[PDB]
């Protein structure tokens, strides 16, 4: 659900070693960060490995590979997290494609619950 | 004349997600329709739960008085798969459930919607804590379950032996899915389904043909991947016997008036409201019918969402069927 | 004291397949157990059906008198997929059904087991032929179905409107599958399943957990293809409420006393015989319980099959639960 | 179901252009031949194409490719059919492996119903 709102418009900004952008969770309530089981990120069609990913929720920045220790860190309903991607080369100006594929470990649901979205974003300075 | 109208704030998720409606906006919308009973999802529109302070809860109480609304029901969740590689232990689960009992006690609710998948054994262990707050625990019955499903049958076994009036049920109207929901079929075709096969699937749904036959038959007729997923929804939407409710009236604490689409004629397009509501009248039901709009996730890909309008129509329809 | 004992000769399929027992051998075995009511499968042990001549049928009549047995039930089949690339027309199906009505009339039977997948629409169209032979049509209710499944519910609608006493049901005891059947599980492990995974599955079966949760759960814990097939059997075996039978007693013409395994205690090891038979008594049931042994297909890979012995124990058990 | 009895012992005999053997249907009642949807025959692990296979039931021998027209030709319960396999070379004496893989179009069942068996038969003279 809410797939069309996963990648937030106008949120792509350069940071040292990569780019950041805004992401919303495709689920109808808050969920502990530890149950965001998979999050496949693509920039310009290239997959960004999990070791190069961070999620910022409110005032908390966590490496994506350590989310298991965030059992009580809530991705609140509709809260925008800032995802930071370390990239192997600097990004030029203009528009770029950002893809996100979610898998949620939902306890009352037997298989990972899925939502997916992709948008073309311009690099805002 | 004792059936009361309420709304689950789950109905406004699209506007709340987009920050188009606040939490108070949601209660406000509700009173304007005469739906004074509120069912709410703490993990959805009260960030900071379960660490809400007395200022929040006292503030919620003051809001209820301003709108004349009544806080009826809290919808709990249980994230048993919170820890990777394991499920919560029984002691950890009681802790999660008691959070919800406390919060529901502090919110002024009289009943909790207990998730359908919660085990009979877990219901038994938190019961003494429920007793301490004079708090009812109502197991949601939603598709593909029904009041005769062995999982519910086993729950009834436990409640019969324990004998507590605080243990009961919340029927969800998806067990009275008379037709394959139109908005589901229409989204399916937008996703690439073969329209003639959607029509076959919708046709077989009305015929009550076994889900597994329809799946293999759609497979057999050359369905693409989207058609197959469409057919398998027949395992997740079911019809059930509306008169079966008369047997359980003492345990029906609250009802999920689920709906997906109210047309311009104020008629719900796939669910059996016209059959279920007379039975509740026949049975002496004095609880709430709580609007639970879920159409948003199906229509949002091609249409703007109007949860407020949709609930207005659902509430007008409920009022008519009750006789007010 | 109104329940009568019978046997479906389907119980002896293994010995019949191997030509160890003739048809008359099967009836003979039946009378020696005091099971005088006979249920038969024309397409299984009377080659030449539906072209049996008066010489055959008169001889069947003479056999019944010799053994004191009574021809109770004929079990029809309907091969709707007989033609490749299409199904039978509704009109073609009536012809197939009438074969079976005629034969059952000619066999001296009082009821036909109409296959569970038969449509309400076909039942309605063949009803006049049943009326002409004063022949009862008993729809088999077998797993995962039950008297509250919408397919049976739709059948109930048709029979309610038409009002004919020739239309009814034959409950098959697999809708009263209390535990995951031992002989099935043992073959699954013999086929390469993980015994630890089988134990989880069997435990979860008794707990009444939704089949689909079990499927994904067995999947998630590393189950092999046999384990997956083992788990998915939870979609094909179900418990249902035995007291639901009381509501439909007038439509219960006959009972499939399905069983898989009688232990050395004259106890059936997985089906809810001890619950259903008391209810039938409460309801005044006066029909037959016909042993329907199906254990052969599960044990035959590693064990000699003894359907006669197995039926002797089942018949001794039926007598016990009946009170004779 | 009845898998261990599909291939009949001691039935392998030479005929012109191949071999024949006895086959039983792994089903609990008689079935029209038209619903034997697949019958994959292997001899010594080699697949015998469907056009080189015939089925004899009682006094009727039909080419396997024409079984669709045999809607009322019944494979009776327990009846042994003589299956004749046209082979590209004569089979030497002694023991050989014979495999059969059935798919039955059963009307009340949603997917092809399956049964499989293989036995080592000696070419009996």
Please choose, from the candidates B115, B126, B108, B14, the residue with its C-alpha nearest in 3D space to the C-alpha of residue B52: B108
Interface residue C263 vs chain B (CB under 8 A): no
How many C-beta neighbours within 10 Å does residue C180 have? 20
Cis check for the bond before B26: say yes or no (omega within 30 of 0).
no
Query: Could you tell me if residue B323 is left (phi over 0), alpha (psi between -120 and 50 degrees) or otherwise beta?
Result: left
Half-sphere exposure of B56 (CA within 13 A, CB side): 14
Cβ–Cβ gap D107/C13 under 8 Å:
no
Shared domain for B113 and B157, answered yes or no, is yes
What's the distance, CA C281 to chain centroid?
Answer: 20
Burial C241-279 (b: 16+ CB within 10 A, else e): bbebbeebbebbbbbbbbbbbbeeeeebbbbbbebbbeb
**Interface with C, mutate which of B86, B200, B222, B241 (most C CBs under 10 A):** B241
Residue B138 CA to residue B113 CA, distance in Å, equals 5
Q: Specify the length of chain B in residues.
A: 324
Is there a single domain that holds both residue C290 and residue C304? yes
Tokens 């002694």, located at residue:
D94
Pairing mode, strands B4-8 and B37-40: parallel
Radius of gyration of chain A (CA): 14
Q: How many CB atoms lie within 10 A of CB B214?
A: 22
- Phi/psi of residue D53, nearest 5 degrees: -120, 135
Q: Tell me which chain B residue has its CA closest to the CA of residue A4.
A: B301
**Are the C-beta atoms of residues C291 and C314 closer than 8 Å to each other?**
yes
- Whether C44 has its CB under 8 Å from any CB of chain B: the answer is no
- Asked whether residue B256 is marked as a ligand-binding residue, the answer is yes
Q: Specify the residue for token string 């009444």.
A: C208
- Across the interface, whether the CB atoms of C43 and D77 are under 8 A apart is answered yes
Q: Helices (H), strands (E): how many in chain C? A: 14, 9
Name the helix (H) or strand (E) containing B284: none
DSSP chain A: --GGGSBPTT--EEETTEEEEEE--SSSS-EEGGGEEEEEEEETTEEE-GGGEEEEETTEEEEGGGGGG-TT-EE-TTPPEEEEEE-SS---SSEEEEEEEEEE--TTSSS-EEEEEEEEEE---
CA distances from C232 to B271, C136, C237 (A): 30, 35, 10
What does the alpha-carbon distance between residue C96 and residue C82 come to, in Å, rounded to a whole number? 11
Nearest C-alpha neighbor of A44 from the set A82, A6, A94: A94
Taking the CA of residue C323 as centre, how many other CA atoms within 13 Å lie in the half-sphere pointing to its CB? 7
Query: H-helix or E-strand containing C307?
Result: helix C307-322
CA Rg value for chain B? 20
Number of Cβ within a 10 Å radius of residue A9 = 12
The CA angle C58-C64-C70, to the nearest 5 degrees, is: 120
Q: Which helix (H) or strand (E) holds C171?
A: strand C167-171
Q: Looking at the complex, does the CB of residue C297 fall below 8 Å from at least one CB of chain D?
A: yes
Give SS3 for B255. strand
Name the closest residue on chain B to residue A112, using Cα atoms: B81
Do B311 and B196 have their domain in common?
Answer: no
Q: With touching defined as 3+ CB pairs under 8 A, do chains B and A touch?
A: yes
Domain span including residue A26:
3-122
Q: Report the residue numbers after which chain C has a gap, meaning the C atom sits over 2.5 angstroms from the next written residue's N, or none.
A: none
Interface with C, mutate which of B81, B142, B145, B149 (most C CBs under 10 A): B149
Q: How many residues does chain A have?
A: 125
Nearest in space to B211 (alpha carbons), one of C323, D25, C149: C149
**Cα(B55)–Cα(B61) distance, integer angstroms:** 10
> In which element (H, E) is residue C257 found?
strand C255-259
Q: Hey, what are C246's tokens?
A: 């009381």
The CATH number of residue B130's host domain is 3.20.20.150
**Interface check A107 vs C, CB under 8 A:** no
> Rounded to 5 degrees, what are φ and ψ at B31?
-65, -35
Task: Look up residue B91 and give its two tokens.
Answer: 């002691």
**Which sign does the torsion angle of CA C49, C50, C51, C57 carry?**
positive
Whether B118 and B33 share a structural domain: yes
Strands C37-40 and C4-8: parallel
D35 closest CA partner among C82, A86, B201, B135: C82
What is the least distance, in Å, from the CA of A103 to any CA of chain B? Answer: 13
Question: Is C9 within 8 Å of C39 (Cβ atoms)?
Answer: yes
Find, in chain B, the residue whose alpha carbon is nearest to that of D106.
B213
Domain count, chain D: 1
Would you give the distance in Å from CA B289 to the centre of its chain?
A: 10
Residue B148 Rama label (left phi>0; alpha psi -120 to 50; beta): alpha
Is chain B adjacent to chain C, meaning 3+ CB pairs within 8 angstroms? yes
How many CA within 13 A on the CB side of residue A30? 20
C-alpha torsion sign, points B35, B41, B45, B46: positive
Q: Find, in chain D, the residue whose alpha carbon is nearest to that of C11.
A: D28
Q: Output the known binding site of C.
A: 140, 172, 256, 292
Chain breaks in chain B (C to N over 2.5 A) after: none
Rounded distance between C-alpha atoms, residue B262 and residue B258, angstroms: 11
Contacts of B66 (CB under 8 A, 6+ apart): none
Q: Which residues contact B195 (CB under 8 A, 6 or more apart)?
A: B189
Cβ-nearest to D32 among C10, C79, C117 = C79
- Same domain, yes or no: C111 and C204: no
Across B56-94, b (16+ Cβ under 10 Å) vs e yields: ebeebeebbeebebbbbbbbbbbbbbbbeeeebeeeebb
Write out the E strands in chain B: 4-8, 37-40, 70-75, 111-114, 136-141, 167-171, 255-259, 288-293
Domain count, chain C: 2
Neighbours of chain A (3+ CB pairs under 8 A): B, C
Does the beta-carbon distance from D107 to C17 stay under 8 Å?
no
Task: List C-alpha distances in Å: B143 to B71, B148, B238, B254, B297.
Answer: 26, 12, 6, 17, 17
Contacts of B146 in chain C (CB under 8 A): 148
Residue C218: its chain A contacts at CB < 8 A? Answer: none
- B294 annotated as ligand-binding: no
Question: What is the least distance, in Å, from the CA of B10 to any CA of chain A?
Answer: 8
B217, D111: Cβ pair inside 8 Å?
Answer: no
Asked if C115 is an interface residue toward chain D (Cβ–Cβ < 8 A), one would say yes
* Contact present, A87 and A17 (Cβ < 8 Å): yes
Domain that holds residue B121: 4-178+240-322
With beta carbons under 8 A apart, name residues in chain C contacting D2.
Answer: 17, 297, 300
Q: Which residues, including other chains, have CB under 8 Å from residue C186's CB and lie 6 or more apart?
A: C298
Residue D35 to residue C77, Cβ atoms within 8 A: no
The strand pair at A95-104 and A36-43 is best described as antiparallel
- Please report residues of A whose CB lies closer than 8 A to that of C212: 110
Judge if B211 and B77 occupy the same domain: no
* All residues at 6 or more sequence positions from C188 whose CB lies less than 8 Å from its CB, including other chains: C198, C226, C227, C229, C230
Measured in residues, chain D has a length of 125
Given a contact cutoff of 8 angstroms between Cβ atoms, the answer to whether C244 and C141 are in contact is no
Q: Which class for C222: exposed (0-12), middle (13-18), buried (19 or more C-beta within 10 A)?
A: exposed
Q: In Å, what resolution does this model reach?
A: 3.3
- Tell me whether strands D80-86 and A74-75 are parallel, antiparallel or unpaired: unpaired
Structure tokens at C96: 């197939």
Same domain, C170 and C192: no
DSSP state letter for C88 = P
Q: Which residue has the tokens 């609880």?
A: B287
What's the residue count for chain C?
Answer: 324
Chain C closest CA to A62's CA: distance in Å? 27
* CATH number of the domain that residue A23 is part of: 2.60.40
Contacts of C85 in chain B (CB under 8 A): none
Q: Is B84 on the interface with A (CB under 8 A)?
A: yes
Q: Do both B99 and B155 map to the same domain?
A: yes
Distance from chain centroid for Cα C224: 31
Name residues whose C-beta falls within 8 Å of residue A115's C-beta, 6 or more positions apart in sequence: A1, A2, A3, A6, A26, A27, A102, A104
Which residues in C lie closer than 8 A to residue A110 (C-beta atoms)? 210, 212-213, 215-217
The CA-CA-CA angle for residues A77, A79, A81, to 5°, reads 130
In a domain, D124, yes or no: no
E strands, chain D, in order: 13-15, 18-24, 31-32, 36-43, 46-48, 53-57, 60-63, 74-75, 80-86, 95-104, 113-122
Burial of C160 (0-12, 13-18, 19+ CB in 10 A): exposed
Q: If residue C1 lies in a helix (H) or strand (E), which one and from where to where?
A: none
Token pair of C112 as six digits: 């036909």
List, as ranges, residues 203-232 from B with C-beta within 8 Å of D: 212-213, 215-217
**Alpha helical stretches, state H, C18-89:** 23-31, 42-45, 54-67
User: Which chains are within 8 Å of D by 3+ CB pairs?
Assistant: B, C
**B58 beta partners:** none
**Distance, CA of D30 to CA of D58 (rounded, Å):** 13
- B203, B232, B261 — which closes off a domain? B232
Cβ neighbours of residue C253 closer than 8 Å, sequence gap 6 or more: C111, C136, C138, C168, C169, C170, C287
- Closest listed residue to residue D83, CA positions, set D43, D112, D122: D43
- Note whether C145 and C280 are same-domain residues: yes
Q: Among residues C196, C213, C233, which one ends one of the domains?
A: C233
Verify that B123 and B23 share a domain, yes or no. yes
C228 burial (CB, 10 Å; 0-12 / 13-18 / 19+) is middle
Largest separation between any pair of C-alpha atoms in chain D? 44
What sections of C110-262 are H helices per DSSP?
120-132, 150-162, 182-190, 195-207, 211-220, 225-232
**Shortest Cα distance, chain C CAs vs residue D20, angstroms:** 21
Chain C: give the shortest CA distance to residue B151, in Å: 5
Whether C19 sits inside 8 A of D78 (CB atoms) is yes
Residue D93 domain-assigned (yes or no): yes
Which residue in B13, B18, B25 has the most chain A C-beta atoms within 10 A of its own C-beta, making it the best mutation to test that interface?
Answer: B13
C244 touches chain B (CB under 8 A): yes
Interchain pair B78, A2: CB under 8 A? no
D88: burial class by Cβ within 10 Å (0-12, 13-18, 19+)? exposed
* Strands (DSSP E) found in C1-118: 4-8, 37-40, 47-50, 70-75, 111-114
Does D68 lie at the interface with C, CB-CB under 8 angstroms? yes
A110 touches chain C (CB under 8 A): yes
Q: Are B318 and B33 in contact (CB under 8 A)?
A: no
- Residue D125 counted as domain residue: no
If asked whether residues B123 and B189 sit together in one domain, one would say no
Are B39 and B7 a contacting pair, CB within 8 Å? yes
To test the contact with chain A by mutation, choose from C204, C209, C211, C216 the residue with the greatest count of A C-beta atoms within 10 A, namely: C216
Q: How many A/B residue pairs have CB atoms within 8 Å?
A: 71
What is the Cα–Cα distance from B68 to B35, expressed in whole angstroms?
Answer: 10
- Whether residue C235 lies within 8 A of chain B, CB to CB, comes out as yes
Distance of CA B214 to the CA centre of its chain: 27
Q: How far is Cα B197 from Cα D115, in angstroms, rounded to an integer?
A: 31
Nearest CA in chain C to B147: C148
Cβ <8 Å between C213 and A111: no
Please give the C-alpha separations between residue C32 and each of B287, C4, C315, in angstroms, as whole numbers. Answer: 61, 15, 11
Which candidate from A4, A77, A105 shows the least CB-CB separation from B45?
A77
User: In the numeric block, which tokens belong to residue A120?
Assistant: 């073309």
Helix B225-232 crosses helix B195-207 at what angle (to 10 degrees)? 20
Residue/partner pairs of A61-70 with CB below 8 Å, 24 or more apart: A62/A33, A64/A39, A67/A33, A67/A34, A67/A36, A68/A34, A68/B83, A68/B84, A69/A34, A70/A32, A70/A33, A70/A34
Same domain, B216 and B287: no
């Amino acid at each position: 659900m809410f797939d069309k709102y996963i990648v937030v418009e106008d949120s792509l900004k350069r940071v040292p070693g990569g780019v950041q952008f805004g992401v919303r969770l495709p689920y109808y309530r808050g969920l502990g960060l530890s149950m965001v089981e998979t999050m496949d990120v693509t920039v310009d069609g290239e997959r960004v490995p999990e070791e190069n990913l961070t999620v910022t929720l409110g005032d908390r920045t966590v490496p994506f590979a350590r989310r298991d220790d965030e059992t009580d860190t809530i991705w609140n309903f509709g809260e925008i997290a800032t995802v930071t991607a370390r990239l192997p080369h600097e990004l030029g100006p203009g528009e770029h494609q950002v893809g996100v594929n979610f898998g949620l470990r939902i306890s009352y649901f037997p298989v990972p619950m899925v939502g997916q979205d992709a948008k073309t974003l311009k690099l805002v300075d | 004349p004792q059936i009361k109208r309420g709304v689950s704030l789950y109905s406004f998720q699209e506007e709340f997600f987009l920050r188009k409606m606040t939490l108070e906006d949601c209660v406000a919308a509700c009173a304007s329709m005469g739906a004074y009973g509120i069912e709410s999802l703490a993990e959805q529109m009260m960030p900071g739960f379960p660490n809400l302070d007395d200022a929040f809860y006292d503030g919620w109480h003051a809001m209820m008085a301003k709108y004349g609304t009544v806080s009826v029901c809290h919808d709990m969740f249980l994230d048993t798969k919170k820890f990777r590689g394991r499920l919560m232990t029984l002691d950890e689960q009681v802790e999660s459930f008691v959070r919800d009992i406390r919060h529901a006690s502090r919110l002024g609710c009289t009943v909790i919607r207990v998730l359908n998948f919660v085990s009979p054994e877990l219901m038994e262990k938190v019961l003494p804590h429920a007793e301490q707050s004079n708090m009812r625990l109502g197991l949601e019955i939603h598709a593909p379950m029904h009041f005769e499903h062995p999982w519910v049958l086993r729950h009834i076994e436990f409640m019969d032996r324990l004998g507590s009036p605080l243990l009961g049920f919340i029927p969800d109207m998806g067990i009275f899915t008379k037709h394959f929901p139109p908005v589901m079929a229409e989204r399916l075709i937008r996703q690439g389904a073969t329209p003639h096969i959607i029509e076959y699937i919708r046709e077989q749904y009305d015929r009550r043909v076994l889900a597994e036959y329809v799946v293999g038959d759609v497979r057999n007729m050359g369905g693409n991947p989207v058609d197959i997923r469409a057919a398998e929804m027949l395992r997740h939407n079911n019809w059930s016997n509306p008169r079966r409710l008369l047997e359980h009236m003492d345990r029906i604490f609250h009802v999920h008036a689920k709906f997906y689409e109210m047309d311009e004629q104020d008629r719900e397009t796939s669910l059996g409201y016209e059959e279920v509501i007379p039975v509740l009248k026949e049975g002496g039901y004095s609880g709430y019918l709580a609007s639970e709009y879920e159409g948003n996730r199906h229509i949002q890909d091609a249409f703007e969402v109007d949860s407020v309008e949709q609930v207005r129509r659902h509430q007008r329809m409920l009022a008519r069927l009750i006789g007010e």
